[PDB]
Amino acid sequence: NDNITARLDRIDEKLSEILGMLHTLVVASAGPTSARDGIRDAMVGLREEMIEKIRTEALMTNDRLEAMARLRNEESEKMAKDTSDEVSLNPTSEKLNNLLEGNDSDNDLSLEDF
Amino acid sequence: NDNITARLDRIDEKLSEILGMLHTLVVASAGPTSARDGIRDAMVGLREEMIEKIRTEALMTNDRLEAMARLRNEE
Amino acid sequence: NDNITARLDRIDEKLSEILGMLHTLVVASAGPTSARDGIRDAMVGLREEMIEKIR
Amino acid sequence: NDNITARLDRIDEKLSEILGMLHTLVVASAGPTSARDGIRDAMVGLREEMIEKIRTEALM
Amino acid sequence: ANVYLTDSYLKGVISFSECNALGSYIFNGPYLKNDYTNLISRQNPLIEHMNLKKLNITQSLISKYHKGEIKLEEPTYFQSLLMTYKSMTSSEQIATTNLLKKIIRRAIEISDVKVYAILNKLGLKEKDKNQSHLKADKNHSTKQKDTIKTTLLKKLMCSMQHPPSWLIHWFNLYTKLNNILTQYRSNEVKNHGFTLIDNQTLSGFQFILNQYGCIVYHKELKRITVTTYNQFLTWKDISLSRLNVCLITWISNCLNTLNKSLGLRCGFNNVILTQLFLYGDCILKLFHNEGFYIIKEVEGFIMSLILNITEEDQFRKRFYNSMLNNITDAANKAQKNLLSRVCHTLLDKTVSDNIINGRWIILLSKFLKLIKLAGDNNLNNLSELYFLFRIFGHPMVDERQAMDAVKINCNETKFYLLSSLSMLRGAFIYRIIKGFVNNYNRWPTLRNAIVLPLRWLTYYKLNTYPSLLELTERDLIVLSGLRFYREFRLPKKVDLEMIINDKAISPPKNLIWTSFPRNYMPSHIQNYIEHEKLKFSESDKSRRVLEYYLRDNKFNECDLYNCVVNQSYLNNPNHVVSLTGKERELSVGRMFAMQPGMFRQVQILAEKMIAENILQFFPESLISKCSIITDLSKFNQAFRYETSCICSDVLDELHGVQSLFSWLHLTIPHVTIICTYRHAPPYIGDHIVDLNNVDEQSGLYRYHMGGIEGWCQKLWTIEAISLLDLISLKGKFSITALINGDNQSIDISKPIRLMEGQTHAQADYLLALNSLKLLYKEYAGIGHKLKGTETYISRDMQFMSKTIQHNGVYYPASIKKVLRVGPWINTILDDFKVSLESIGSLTQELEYRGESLLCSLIFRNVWLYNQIALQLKNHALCNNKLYLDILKVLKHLKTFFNLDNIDTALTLYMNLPMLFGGGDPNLLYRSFYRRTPDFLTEAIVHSVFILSYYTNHDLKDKLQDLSDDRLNKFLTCIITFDKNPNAEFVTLMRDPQALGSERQAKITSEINRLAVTEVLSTAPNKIFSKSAQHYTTTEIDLNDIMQNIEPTYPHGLRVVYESLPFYKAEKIVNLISGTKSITNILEKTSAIDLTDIDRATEMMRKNITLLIRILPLDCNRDKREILSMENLSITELSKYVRERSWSLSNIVGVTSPSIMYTMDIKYTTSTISSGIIIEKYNVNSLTRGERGPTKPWVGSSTQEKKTMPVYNRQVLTKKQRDQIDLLAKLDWVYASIDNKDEFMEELSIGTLGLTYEKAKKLFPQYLSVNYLHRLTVSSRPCEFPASIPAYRTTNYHFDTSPINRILTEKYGDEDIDIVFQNCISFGLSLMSVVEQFTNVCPNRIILIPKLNEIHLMKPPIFTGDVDIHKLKQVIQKQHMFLPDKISLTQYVELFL
């Protein structure tokens, strides 16, 4: 059967296209506009123009670097640092760590001095 | 056998309309200045479709309650 | 066959439903200035229609 | 006829997925903006309770 | 003229804007932070600040400051000074040392009676197993042996004779600050508007103290500061907390020196504790106000120090490093914020050079090293080291800067992918479906059944659901699109109990300007206030809720259920949510919100519907394994409309209403969120009279778009659990969640053991890392970014409920709990009974958790003796009346018995129970078990045991001969008395345990009820007015209803009381009867009326003197016939008292025998070998803190067996099911009554719409014949636990057959009076206390009952009939509180 299966396959082609198009969507939350005097409605668009707007700062956002990398499915820097064998300490934290270890009683610290 | 194929053609035209609606939705909600200016200022016969869908839904909601009240009255 | 026509009807119902949902979406989002009054006027109209239909 | 039923079931399941996803989009699309214009009851529908109230006013 | 009684403790928050607005006026410059408060204060000074400055001494201080001889300062600096009170002469130190030695010697002597009684009844007199020097004294030993009869306390008293210095230090700080406070309070109650000026109480300081502000000056260092009254209360509280810590550690250390098991489980060297406190104050001084950030974040250090002991290497290092980094980040934030704040103000020079120099790191390091040393690598010391969180003061919290950060975080744009929200909603609806199927064996009704695959239609046709492991991802999206018909109905009449509460609510928007004082608001705003005040009603211009409901002129019961469905709360013109900084925690945290009243109704309703219906579906909400612990604060703001409302719409749809559970996100974005504290007014400009035109500032903002903390917490718990289900679906690991609303604990298991790669751990570590990656990704995809500060991973350690448990053992933080225990703790208008009750309760909590008896005992008696003897003179309302009355009672007890001195009278007074007007807060049983059905028997057994101290007794049985007849005289004086019964039946209903006939003292609600009734009679609300006017006669009818019936069962009367529509009125009344302000609510003044003070002091004097009335010395020759001591069953005596007091013929089923008096203790098995046997299966020396094999034991009373009918309970309300159950209990208990059919007819027709017969189809019929033994009412104790913590009970095992043998041979196979749970409970507690006292836990223990006191019990037969006319009148007079009537449509849809 050629004709019926051909029509069926055209149906399935269009249908899978629609399904992919739907899986692509991204929806933005409601919010206030710049020079806030009213609430803009929630807008839904394809991903690409959305990320373009995030990149060109058309919408007020706290952080933009994480959002675009997260939408692009890639693991950013912070995430890796958040999930690692160990967490890189700070310089001042290194001073605290060196002062905690090595209890040689060199503090020469007077309670009245502080 | 052939009526099957006619039904499949009906399904094909319906899915094509659906795809057109999807494109229209995404491009209308994506359009930066196409929302206020360059607006369709149209879709009045679609409002009637949506309101009649809500009408049929409201009747379907109201029909089940009326069975219960009439059963209360009879029993 | 019987299974074939039954499933064709069910698929037709699903198509009608998705068409209705697409309709309400595309009409709700497009224009604020018109819908803001058109839809609620039509809603109070539907309310009056229900009152008169039960009456 | 077997392949007919199998392909029809595939189409059925995929249509169901489309319809569910579009439904959740419709629901989450009401939002605090449409509540200003009173269009919310339009998109999400009319539930039982209020309609029953209407029925009361219909009888008196 | 009215008085103004002030708080004795903090009971509130310290303020920031208050200190600022005071200092800016006094010193004519910005004091704490440059802000609008300084401008508006200098421009328009307030009244009370004008009065404070108007004084002459503060003007001298200002003049001395302008020249530059003194320099300004920060309140925390003076905190640091006051704490290190170096200036102490010799004479005051000697006086305080003598006073402390006295308090100690007196507190050790009072507990001797209870310890002696315990050691007798235990039979443990034998094998009990500086101090020696001062024991070997001649005269000191004689003076000790004068009144102490137990060597165990002779040794301890001798050892505690020389107290250390730090104890004396904190003691004198406490006494001096306390003296200043009480002197001010007394003089303020006397003369109004009084300011206290003192410069000689605390050596070197100078206080100018007042209700509105305080000024402290120190000359030798020439510093001055300005603070608020709350700040001084806080300084007092800090001194008190440190005093308590020192006392507890002192007693525990001496006791533990005696024996290893007596004291608490923790050891401390108080020198380390003192250095620790001092370094804390040093940090607080270095960082002026931002030091509390550092002190907060230090909390991670103790968790890390525990993980060092309980965790493998990787998690150990990971947590260590994260915690260090968080501490240092906190410190840097604090420093920078301080320098920014104090840049341009008066306190610009005070910033030390050690901040800039960079040398605070050495100080912080020393502080952390001191904490590490005080821990000393022990789990106990580290567990109970949490109190450091509490010692230092609470921070000065500022309103404005607390919102701005929340603003930056709150209103923003979030992006989600459609699949994420879709799968979330799919998981939600899956959970609801699973709940319906597993609960009602029925799938919920759907309207969109067409959209469903065949593989799911086959799941619908047959009522069953697919399991979780089979379920896939894509299927969830399929399940995302469905709709539901109504399943749960909505209650129509407002429930008045849940809604009324004393908490405040904001005024409507147009009137909100009436929160700020008259002075601060400009001219035109005041003109508008005055011109508009009339437009609104008198109802809503109310500051609190009690007033709001007591002034409703048009108040309809159907208004709420009409409004929630008409959608009037959306798009409302006057809606404003105002944040107030009254949330109390160590960090600044947040500040809680208040709406108008109507929206508060709607929000309470939403939460109530969820809690009633939905939360029953998510029971979680209150072999590679990994637990993950997450903080859940700031989880609210990340929510937006989509994320929450997609899941909320399902509940909204089930309930059939529209936009009920979605109100929050639908109306909050429009309204203007402002801060409303009295001293923090936002700059209004001009020509602006409403909020929607005011220009945004640091104070108020708009467009929130996010949850507000606290509201709709249940929605977020539910949706978090659903999202977590989804995570488990994507990650493929068996998951489990525990959310209490403050910390979310997620544990994970995966079956990849035996498949490991070359390591048995460090693979679950990789599981942890992978799962955490997935979880971060998921929560971020939902829109709530998860920070590395909140979450942490563990394997064997789990912090739950702020309680530490490791290896199945519990570690208690008691010292935190008993930290503040003082003279007038937990009082309302300076009570005596309530104070003693609260002291008793807190210290008994110490004894239940900390696992030490003698410590709790001595520590309770210290503060009891304090409040009784030393600080009872200095009282607010009455100068010396209470001291005079207690002196009378002591002289009376001295004459009645043969006590030598008033001091011994005070001993025997502090040991007598409070039921007889004594001073013992908590009876002698509470040590051994927690609950009992009756109190009077325990009171009598306790008094017998206590009197057994002065008169020698064996306590193994009743001695036939008593040379000293003190006990017998007491008994014969307690049995014989007059009869004056009035209103016996209604009283027996309200309190089933009552005695009556003026043999027991009256509590405050009973006294104030009449005044509350009268003031309620004149209330503009028709409901309260009618139900108050008719309140008197309903009592008479209720009294007459059950009068005719001859045999009287109290609990049955209790059910009769609960079924009738009088319970809710009594509740609403005795709710109001608890507040200090009565007869004055309608006049809207905080001050109280004098007649209330008069009734309070009169009732206090009477309740104090009660003991004379109970125990009069006159009936010695009036009635010389004394009862014999031959048999003397005490249960008979208690029944006799309870019957004679009410003069009734017979009262049945309310007197359970005292298990302490019943059983006897024995160790060597006999030929009898009867009684319950308790043996420990583990073999050790000391089982304290070591877990055993068996499962724990909680005593669960025998249930009641009932057959439930077949119908759908879903379509019904909660209150209706409750009432049907009550009526079922009535049908069960009153079958013998003759009016049954008529009486039940009237009850069913009155409470419900149904007639009786139809109604009978719903009554679950009970199958148990004996209701005396098996019944369920709010008056009866439900479970009978043990004192010891749960984990210890696992170590033992109990066998109860040998006693059952004799209990079945005589009076066989019938119910008996004694309740069996308390037997084994007392056995376990007995094992524990024996271990404490002898230090070697016994191998086996056996309990033999006493065959006398175990009486019979049989289901009685009732006789007489009820009064139906008066019952109908009761139900008619107060009909507003009736539960909703079951309509006909509801009943017809019931059976389907």
TrEMBL record, chain D:
Coiled coil: none annotated. It is found in: Host cytoplasm; Virion. Homotetramer. Interacts with protein M2-1; the interaction between the two tetramers is required for the anti-termination and elongation transcriptional activities of protein M2-1. Interacts with host phosphatase PP1; this interaction recruits PP1 to the inclusion bodies. Formation of a complex PP1/M2-1/P allows P to target host PP1 phosphatase to the M2-1 substrate. Interacts (via C-terminus) with the nucleoprotein N (via N-terminus); the phosphorylated phosphoprotein P binds to N-RNA complex. Interacts (via N-terminus) with the monomeric RNA-free nucleoprotein N. Belongs to the pneumoviridae phosphoprotein P family. This is Phosphoprotein. The lineage of its organism: Viruses, Riboviria, Orthornavirae, Negarnaviricota, Haploviricotina. The gene is P. The chain holds residues 128 to 187 of 241 of the full protein.
UniProtKB/TrEMBL annotation, chain E:
It is found in: Host cytoplasm; Virion. Keywords: ATP-binding, Host cytoplasm, Hydrolase, Magnesium, Metal-binding, Methyltransferase, mRNA capping, mRNA processing, Multifunctional enzyme, Nucleotide-binding, Nucleotidyltransferase, RNA-directed RNA polymerase, S-adenosyl-L-methionine, Transferase, Viral RNA replication, Virion. Its cofactor is Mg(2+). Its main location: host cell. The keyword Hydrolase applies. The keyword Cytoplasm does not apply. GO terms for cellular component: host cell cytoplasm; virion component. It catalyses: a 5'-end (5'-triphosphoguanosine)-(2'-O-methyladenylyl)-adenylyl-cytidylyl-adenosine in mRNA + S-adenosyl-L-methionine = a 5'-end (N(7)-methyl 5'-triphosphoguanosine)-(2'-O-methyladenylyl)-adenylyl-cytidylyl-adenosine in mRNA + S-adenosyl-L-homocysteine; a 5'-end (5'-triphosphoguanosine)-adenylyl-adenylyl-cytidylyl-adenosine in mRNA + S-adenosyl-L-methionine = a 5'-end (5'-triphosphoguanosine)-(2'-O-methyladenylyl)-adenylyl-cytidylyl-adenosine in mRNA + S-adenosyl-L-homocysteine + H(+); GTP + H2O = GDP + phosphate + H(+); a 5'-end (5'-triphosphoguanosine)-adenylyl-adenylyl-cytidylyl-adenosine in mRNA + 2 S-adenosyl-L-methionine = a 5'-end (N(7)-methyl 5'-triphosphoguanosine)-(2'-O-methyladenylyl)-adenylyl-cytidylyl-adenosine in mRNA + 2 S-adenosyl-L-homocysteine + H(+). It is an enzyme of class 2 (transferase). Its EC number is 2.1.1.375, 2.7.7.48, 2.7.7.88. GO terms for molecular function: ATP binding; hydrolase activity; metal ion binding; mRNA 5'-cap (guanine-N7-)-methyltransferase activity; RNA-directed RNA polymerase activity. Residues 624-808 form the RdRp catalytic domain. It comes from the Viruses. Interacts with the phosphoprotein (via C-terminus); the association of P and L forms the polymerase complex. Belongs to the paramyxovirus L protein family. This is Replicase. The chain holds residues 10 to 1461 of 2165 of the full protein.
